[PDB]
Amino acid sequence: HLAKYTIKRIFVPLAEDERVEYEKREKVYKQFLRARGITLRRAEDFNKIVMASGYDERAYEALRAWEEARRIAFNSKNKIRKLREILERHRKDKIIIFTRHNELVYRISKVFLIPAITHRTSREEREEILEGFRTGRFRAIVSSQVLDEGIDVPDANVGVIMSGSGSAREYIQRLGRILRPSKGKKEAVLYELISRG
């Protein structure tokens, strides 16, 4: 019986060289949106359509733009610098990092020696990792795939959600259901890094 679950949404701005690049992409995108008379409050709802309407260089290069932006934000030098702190502040707990961005997963697992689980890895490899997790070896893991569906996942204490440019409402709840109150204290904390600034 948990007794102190607590969420924290951290807003990490972008790097110098980063804002510049990000902005130039989003420029091309927003132009496409207005050029097609679409409000941005409905992007991606729109991209969903752009996708089902076949190919159009025009429209697609815009989606390719939306890509880089999303990308940049996710891998912000700061996102890492920040993650670092979290990993340190919570070196005494079991952490579960999540990100819908495959690349980041690797960037992380390689920058901080954290075992990873993506839509590759394996089936036993995966498991293997989870057993190591629940028995020491390593106190954290980064994973691109969902961890509740089927997967058992050890009792984790802190969860981190490396978002790109927006808040992952769903994911937050999903993860928070998976976490487990600590031994003593029986608390839990969930972070969600979001580029912004």
Curated annotation (Swiss-Prot):
Sites marked Wedge residue: F46
Sequence segments annotated as region (ThM region): 14-75
Organism: Archaeoglobus fulgidus (strain ATCC 49558 / DSM 4304 / JCM 9628 / NBRC 100126 / VC-16)
BP term (GO), one: DNA repair
Subunit annotation: Forms a heterodimer with Bax1.
Note: Conventional DNA helicases unwind DNA by binding to a ssDNA overhang of dsDNA and then translocating on this strand with cycles of ATP binding and hydrolysis to 'unzip' the dsDNA. XPB is believed to be an unconventional DNA helicase principally because it translocates in a 3'-5' direction along dsDNA instead of ssDNA, thus it is referred to as a DNA translocase.
Keyword terms, alphabetized: ATP-binding, DNA damage, DNA repair, DNA-binding, Helicase, Hydrolase, Isomerase, Nucleotide-binding
Chain ranges of the Helicase C-terminal domain: 79-197
Family the entry assigns: Belongs to the helicase family. RAD25/XPB subfamily.
GO MF: ATP binding; catalytic activity, acting on DNA; DNA binding; helicase activity; hydrolase activity
UniProt domain comment: The N-terminus (residues 1-217) binds dsDNA with an abasic nucleotide but not DNA with 5-hydroxyl-cytidine (a non-distorting lesion) or undamaged single-stranded (ss) or double-stranded (ds) DNA. The DRD domain (residues 1-60) structurally resembles the mismatch recognition domain of MutS. The C-terminus (residues 236-434) binds ssDNA and dsDNA. The C-terminus binds Bax1. The N- and C-terminal domains are joined by a flexible hinge region which allows the two domains to rotate and form either an open conformation (no ATPase activity) or closed (has ATPase) activity.
Protein name in UniProt: DNA 3'-5' translocase XPB
Role this protein plays: ATP-dependent DNA translocase which moves along double-stranded DNA (dsDNA) in a 3'-5' direction, unwinding the DNA. Unwinds DNA with a 3'-overhang but not a 5'-overhang or blunt-ended undamaged DNA; does unwind damaged blunt-ended DNA (cyclobutane pyrimidine dimer or thymine (6-4) thymine photoproduct). Binds single-stranded (ss) and dsDNA, as well as damaged DNA. Has very low ATPase activity that is repressed by Bax1; Y-form DNA and a DNA substrate with a 6 base pair bubble in the center stimulate the XPB-Bax1 ATPase activity about 6- to 10-fold.
